[PDB]
């Protein structure tokens, strides 16, 4: 029942600011301090310091003096981390974590928030239907797909018939090549069910697009 839920991924240019949130539930927020831990790609965990959730007083490790601010909204049981004048080397997953518990300092962790510091632009996906050429042979299974091509940054989400089609479905991990992501989802359905009945992939890229594509015979 102790849960720490962090806000979603951020993509930011050098020089900019970012503020991420960590919402705590399942205990008395003001009873335990909140730590922050950085994990940069290809490095191990680095503790950043912590904030005393009663007194409001933060303590920063020397590496994180100057442009990092821990703050609280204690009424919403939420800790915040703001990083200012973002640097390439700030690219990392940031975790919040709270203590225990017999001088335990990292008993419970958030899931982490990726902050990418980059000049790469946000790029919405091109979505294509992956469909066999006509209705298939009698008494077969048909595999349909959507190709979600060339987007940045992650993630996209995919559903089929608005979530109502789930039995067919496999949504594969994104692949990065050049500066962009590609992903595919597939759904396998009985030859008697499609194309007589409509099947549509629904693709969202939370920067800020939603693409629906009805799969029809090519």
């Amino acid at each position: 029942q102790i849960q720490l839920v962090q806000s979603g991924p951020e993509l930011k240019k050098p020089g900019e600011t970012v503020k991420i949130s960590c919402k705590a539930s399942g205990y008395t927020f003001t009873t335990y301090g909140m730590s922050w831990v950085k994990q940069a790609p290809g490095k191990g965990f680095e503790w950043m310091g912590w904030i005393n959730t009663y007194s409001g007083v933060p303590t920063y490790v020397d590496d994180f003096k100057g442009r990092f601010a821990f703050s609280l909204e204690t009424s919403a049981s939420t800790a915040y981390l703001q990083i200012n004048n973002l640097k390439n080397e700030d690219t990392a997953v940031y975790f919040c974590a709270r203590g225990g518990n017999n001088f335990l300092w990292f008993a419970y962790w958030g899931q982490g928030t990726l902050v990418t510091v980059s000049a790469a632009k946000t790029t919405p996906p091109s979505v294509y239907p992956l469909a066999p050429g006509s209705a298939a042979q009698t008494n077969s299974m048909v595999t349909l797909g959507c190709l979600v091509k060339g987007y940045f940054p992650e993630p996209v989400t995919v559903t089929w018939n608005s979530g109502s089609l789930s039995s067919g479905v496999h949504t594969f991990p994104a692949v990065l090549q050049s500066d962009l992501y590609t992903l595919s989802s597939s759904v396998t359905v009985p030859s008697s069910t499609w194309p007589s009945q409509t099947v549509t992939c629904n693709v969202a890229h939370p920067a800020s697009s939603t693409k629906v594509d009805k799969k029809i015979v090519p």
Partner: protein, 218 residues
């Protein structure tokens, strides 16, 4: 380093696993903590482990996890290690350096569990869509599903001989039981049309499976 961990370790499924975190002389009798890190999850507190080998385990840690010590060495033991125990294991240690708290995490040990029973991959391939060809582009889709353990290598062939321009994923869904991966070969529409065939070839724990796409087909 204050904490030394080898970056990787492997163990036979169902055998005993033993991980070493070595403290430097100045911290040779310190208690350490063990954490488990898996993708898409909060990092997990695993145990506190004393110089004498006494330890307490965290919430939701199965009884197969144990700890012991010898001099500056701290060991995490996993009896009958299971596929779900694949993870990065990280040791940590706190201290006071002038009235100021310091905390130091090891670089982590990535643990793989070998000798698991194998399920061979299922492949699904899609040719370029009509829509994408009209844009003069052709992305060949290879979706790889229902396999265990983790980890496949994939190669594309053009006319039964190999090629490079098409990368893919890391190979996971550590939930369910099986894993998924995919690969995309990014071609022009002229390159698509001007070969007899293309082939997605997947190797999994030394067995390979393959499926082809033919431009003549559509």
């Amino acid at each position: 380093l204050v904490l030394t961990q080898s970056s990787s370790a492997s163990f036979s499924l169902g055998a005993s696993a033993k991980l070493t975190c070595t403290l430097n002389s100045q911290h040779s009798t310190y208690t350490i903590e063990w954490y488990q890190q898996q993708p898409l999850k909060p990092p997990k507190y695993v145990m506190e482990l004393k110089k004498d080998g006494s330890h307490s385990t965290g919430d939701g840690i199965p009884d197969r996890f144990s700890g012991s010590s010898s001099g500056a060495d701290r060991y995490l033991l996993i009896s009958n290690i299971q596929p779900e125990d694949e993870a990065i294991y990280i040791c940590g240690v706190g201290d006071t350096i002038k009235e100021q708290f310091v905390y130091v995490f090891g670089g982590g040990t990535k643990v793989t569990v070998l000798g698991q029973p194998k399920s061979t991959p299922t492949l699904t391939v899609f040719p370029p869509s009509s829509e994408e060809l009209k844009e003069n582009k052709a992305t060949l889709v290879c979706l790889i599903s229902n396999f265990s353990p983790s980890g496949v290598t994939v190669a594309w062939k053009a006319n039964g001989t190999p090629i490079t321009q098409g990368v893919d994923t890391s190979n996971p869904t550590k939930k369910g039981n099986k894993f998924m991966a995919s690969s995309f070969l990014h071609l022009t529409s002229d390159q698509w049309r001007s070969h007899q065939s293309f082939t997605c070839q997947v190797t999994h724990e030394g067995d390979t499976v393959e499926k082809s796409l033919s431009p003549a087909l559509r």
